[PDB]
Design a protein around this ligand. Sequence first.
Ligand code: S2V
Length: 291
Amino acid sequence: DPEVTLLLQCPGGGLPQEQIQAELSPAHDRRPLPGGDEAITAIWETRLKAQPWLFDAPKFRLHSATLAPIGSRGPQLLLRLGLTSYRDFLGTNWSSSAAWLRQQGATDWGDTQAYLADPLGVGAALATADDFLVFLRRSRQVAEAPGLVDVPGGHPEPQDLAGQLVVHELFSSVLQEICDEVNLPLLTLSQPLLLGIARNETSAGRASAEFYVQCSLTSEQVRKHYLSGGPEAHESTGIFFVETQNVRRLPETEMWAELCPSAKGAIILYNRVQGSPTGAALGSPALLPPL
Ligand SMILES: CN1CCC(OC(=O)c2cccc(F)c2)CC1
């Protein structure tokens, strides 16, 4: 799967909010482009003169994520974050020249990402009471990954001392994206666990935090809530469900070629961190069938 690489696999079946520290610092920002940020401004002007209803928004930038020694006490993960924007994304990661920017960042900074916006996404492996995961179909008309399968998620917007507020906004935002797109009540959702971080190589290496969330509704009840919003209550064009039993071998199915890279990231991390049991009971052949 060349279009997704794992930056982080969390221990303990995934990390809760209270085990994660953030460092939000301008040291973690994108570096100015070699020929100046005027190249970003030019791409943005061209875009607004065609679609003048577009607006900019701030975004979190992922610099790096350091895990503690396994089995340790205290905070288990440090997220190093800076700030970026939708405008900086369109002029860097989404640019036709994005590979040239990666090569120049290797040359100048020893860092393929130094000249990239790299906005942090969030996605969820969302499980129902009857043991299915939730999938959404993307419109065939949008710019990014048209007609492909996604999971719930989005790109959160700003507003360890300022750190703990940032970690809270990341966890909050994955629940808000589920309520906004799937139309589920907030009280049917568990607190999220962070499973890991995946990178989208088709989008010059921009990263998404992938989370596990449990819902107290069945697949039939989740479907009713999604549909009862009507066509204007969601950006996706349809909802569907795959048994957690069958998610184990999804990379061997025809579905795999229709999944966008960030959804492939969510499913690989679900399989390694929530699946793949370590104990004698769940690891027994009748419960973990070979092959
Ligand atoms: C929904 N509608 C209006 C907004 C358009 O998108 C944006 O201009 C945009 C939306 C969110 C964040 C952002 F930075 C930019 C898409 C069509």
